[PDB]
Amino acid sequence: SWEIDPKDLTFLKELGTGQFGVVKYGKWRGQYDVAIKMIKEGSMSEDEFIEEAKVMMNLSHEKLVQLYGVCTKQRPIFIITEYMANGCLLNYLREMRHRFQTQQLLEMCKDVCEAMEYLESKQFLHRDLAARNCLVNDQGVVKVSDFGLSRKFPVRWSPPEVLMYSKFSSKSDIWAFGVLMWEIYSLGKMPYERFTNSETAEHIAQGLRLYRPHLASEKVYTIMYSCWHEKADERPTFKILLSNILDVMDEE
């Protein structure tokens, strides 16, 4: 069901990801590659954890990193997720010592927009969409992770209404997606690299945004820029963005 027997875990490994990162790898039920993550003790009630795990497991999309189950009969609780061989998107973008053509960067954006259009259609809020929270598999497909119970503050990824009023909505995920497009097109730079949090917020308050990365065409920048409207209701939906992204794919 939602509950998993740790005895169904075989080939337990400690694997590197990026230069200093580490992942606990296993195989689940003889054929599923999984990452094993622990849940902070006492931060949640057991019943509260199970319901949230149930919601997350019913979130099925090829571009969302899947949750396969949880172990609760043990201390600490752990979760098993879809293993992603190429690791964090941020590190993967900076590891571009080789590859990225602009078509590949736009495809990354499309992968994420699909996952997010799915989440939006289920009225589920990510709340921390960022390149650090996307994972890349062995085929180079980008999937969104760290939504749900896979959770100082992501100020550089947050719209003004989150910073001031804590008003989370799909439209705040929209803003963060624009920042994520920026991280992709700049190949993994830090948004607003040399800014205090008040400087970033004063910069936004002045109607100023993240510069056009030079790998981004005018069209691509229009799409990411559209995500950062001051008014939440003036920012697009993930369905509209997808259609914009699919339009720009046809035009190249």
Swiss-Prot record:
Changing R127Q: In XLA; severe; prevents activation due to absence of contact between the catalytic loop and the regulatory phosphorylated residue. GO terms for biological process: adaptive immune response; apoptotic signaling pathway; B cell activation; B cell affinity maturation; B cell receptor signaling pathway; calcium-mediated signaling; cell maturation; cellular response to interleukin-7. GO terms for cellular component: cytoplasm; cytoplasmic vesicle; cytosol; membrane raft; nucleus; perinuclear region of cytoplasm; plasma membrane. Keywords: Acetylation, Adaptive immunity, Apoptosis, ATP-binding, Cell membrane, Cytoplasm, Disease variant, Dwarfism, Immunity, Innate immunity, Kinase, Lipid-binding, Membrane, Metal-binding, Nucleotide-binding, Nucleus, Phosphoprotein, SH2 domain, SH3 domain, Transcription, Transcription regulation, Transferase, Tyrosine-protein kinase, Zinc, Zinc-finger. One of its GO terms (molecular function) is identical protein binding. Clofedanol binds at T81, E82, Y83, M84, L149. Residues 9-249 form the Protein kinase domain. The modification Phosphotyrosine is found at Y211. Changing K37R: In XLA; complete loss of kinase activity. It is found in: Cytoplasm; Cell membrane; Nucleus; Membrane raft. A motif (CAV1-binding) lies at residues 175-182. Changing K37E: In XLA; loss of phosphorylation of GTF2I. Its main location: cytoplasm. The modification Phosphoserine is found at S198, S217. Dasatinib binds at T81, E82, Y83, M84. It is linked to X-linked agammaglobulinemia: Humoral immunodeficiency disease which results in developmental defects in the maturation pathway of B-cells. Affected boys have normal levels of pre-B-cells in their bone marrow but virtually no circulating mature B-lymphocytes. This results in a lack of immunoglobulins of all classes and leads to recurrent bacterial infections like otitis, conjunctivitis, dermatitis, sinusitis in the first few years of life, or even some patients present overwhelming sepsis or meningitis, resulting in death in a few hours. Growth hormone deficiency, isolated, 3, with agammaglobulinemia: An X-linked recessive disorder characterized by growth hormone deficiency, short stature, delayed bone age, agammaglobulinemia with markedly reduced numbers of B cells, and good response to treatment with growth hormone. Part of a complex composed of EEIG1, TNFRSF11A/RANK, PLCG2, GAB2, TEC and BTK; complex formation increases in the presence of TNFSF11/RANKL. Binds GTF2I through the PH domain. Interacts with SH3BP5 via the SH3 domain. Interacts with IBTK via its PH domain. Interacts with ARID3A, CAV1, FASLG, PIN1, TLR8 and TLR9. Interacts with MPL/TPOR. The PH domain mediates the binding to inositol polyphosphate and phosphoinositides, leading to its targeting to the plasma membrane. It is extended in the BTK kinase family by a region designated the TH (Tec homology) domain, which consists of about 80 residues preceding the SH3 domain. This is Tyrosine-protein kinase BTK. It comes from Homo sapiens. The gene is BTK. The chain holds residues 394 to 658 of 659 of the full protein.
